[PDB]
């Protein structure tokens, strides 16, 4: 269930859902696993805000355990293509793909909560078939791993060699360490 609220305007009262009200303020929610349906919905929201105003900052709160890679990469290219600065915030958790979208936000407008947690690892996959086909799918996922590490270094500022060693296995990063790692800019402890 979703509660309904009323926004008061001069013309009259209008009823909005909790998610649509925040959308009016250039705020999008990324919840649950990243799939083709959930990812395509966020893209439509960003484009709608671009047409309404291309000069206002967008805020993206991420709370997700990650998911499909191809679904997430569509959002990353969109955030960089559009003119507005997509601010990212980590609430609760940010897995491998959630962390990639987190650091891809606008530089200087990235935050993480004091008790949030980020986890990063290498892409997962698999295939069943002839040996010739296994080599094809293996080469493709290997290129993605190399591509995902190059972009991670660009926003985090670290070296490509460092990202390769840290992403060999699951690596959890607390909120303070994420700041020191260049993944985020600051922490929103209290309101000022």
């Amino acid at each position: 269930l979703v509660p309904m609220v009323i926004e008061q305007t001069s013309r009259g009262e209008r009823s909005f859902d909790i998610y649509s009200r925040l959308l009016k303020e250039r705020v999008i929610f990324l919840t649950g696993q990243v799939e083709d349906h959930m990812a395509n919905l966020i893209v439509a929201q960003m484009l709608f805000l671009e047409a309404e105003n291309p000069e206002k900052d967008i805020y993206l709160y991420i709370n997700s355990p990650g998911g499909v890679i191809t679904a997430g990469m569509s959002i990353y290219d969109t955030m960089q293509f559009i003119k507005p600065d997509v601010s990212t915030i980590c609430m609760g958790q940010a897995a491998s793909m959630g962390a990639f979208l987190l650091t891809a936000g606008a530089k200087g407008k990235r935050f993480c909560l004091p008790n949030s947690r980020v986890m990063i690892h290498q892409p997962l996959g698999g295939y069943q078939g002839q040996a010739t086909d296994i080599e094809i799918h293996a080469r493709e996922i290997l290129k993605v791993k190399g591509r995902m590490n190059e972009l991670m270094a660009l926003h985090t500022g670290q070296s490509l060699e460092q990202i390769e060693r840290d992403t060999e296995r699951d690596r959890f990063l607390s909120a303070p360490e994420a700041v020191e790692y260049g993944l985020v800019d600051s922490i929103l402890t209290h309101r000022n």
């Binding site: 008061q8 305007t9 001069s10 013309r11 009259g12 009200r21 925040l22 009016k24 303020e25 250039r26 705020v27 206002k56 900052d57 967008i58 805020y59 709160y61 601010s87 915030i89 407008k109 935050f111 929103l188 309101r191």
Partner: protein, 350 residues
Amino acid sequence: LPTPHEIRNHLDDYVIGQEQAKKVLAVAVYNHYKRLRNGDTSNGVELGKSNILLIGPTGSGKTLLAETLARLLDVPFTMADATTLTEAGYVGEDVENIIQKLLQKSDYDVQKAQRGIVYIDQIDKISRKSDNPSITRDVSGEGVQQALLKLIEGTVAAVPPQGGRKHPQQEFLQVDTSKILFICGGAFAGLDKVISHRVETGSGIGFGATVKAKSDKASEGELLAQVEPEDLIKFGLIPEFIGRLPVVATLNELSEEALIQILKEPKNALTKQYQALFNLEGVDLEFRDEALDAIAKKAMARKTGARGLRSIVEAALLDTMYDLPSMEDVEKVVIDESVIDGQSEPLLIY
């Protein structure tokens, strides 16, 4: 004859902390006197009239600005209201009612009606309500504005002078309205949210967005300065109606510190009234800074704090005033902040 610098100097005695609004009004009124005084029968004729649109928060002193100006000003002044009006012969009120109300101030002199000024409050209350499948003919909404268009521009409407003793007179006077000035102003609600979205930043509900922490710490007024006609369209006003009022005023806000100034600097301040009331008795009235601070908080807590000063002050001195004639050999009265709260009694000096 009245110089904008001189008229502004006089208004400063009655107005505190509002400067931009004074400059705007001074030019218009000076032009109005000049327009009516000078015949204008030169190569250039039919000079245009710049009507004034006043915007400000509730209880900011708009009514006092028109009335205090009317006090020193010779021409008559009236205080009408827009909410009572209802278009096309409806139950509420005919537009013509405004004109007949003016004549009483002008002693039924047509020449004096063109000289006088008119003021309207709560103009925002008639904002075009936009609900599509309800009526589609909003009497209280847009409809009222359409009727005022011809009125402000200029026209002659029949008005029974004095109402008539009985049917015997059965006559009406022709009153011009072109030369008449109109001051339509009201505290708009929700206007700050409209301009914030389009002018400053991505504010609102979210974390990074600027929260409304400065609800009372800072004044929203500075935002109103960047107002334009296009923003009023979203509010409900018709562009034609806005064209009739080119000039605009800001009247940012009243400050807690300004309340202290209102009690000391103005000639009609409450402190000076009670001070003279007791001076005749051979007693002096002293107000302390601590006492004024308590009054500000109490007035701020209640609605329309500016209009509530009389209640707070009167209750504090009601008991003392009763015993002052009875008491003898008392030359001074001291008021403390504790007395304002009601936990203490004012000190008496013999």
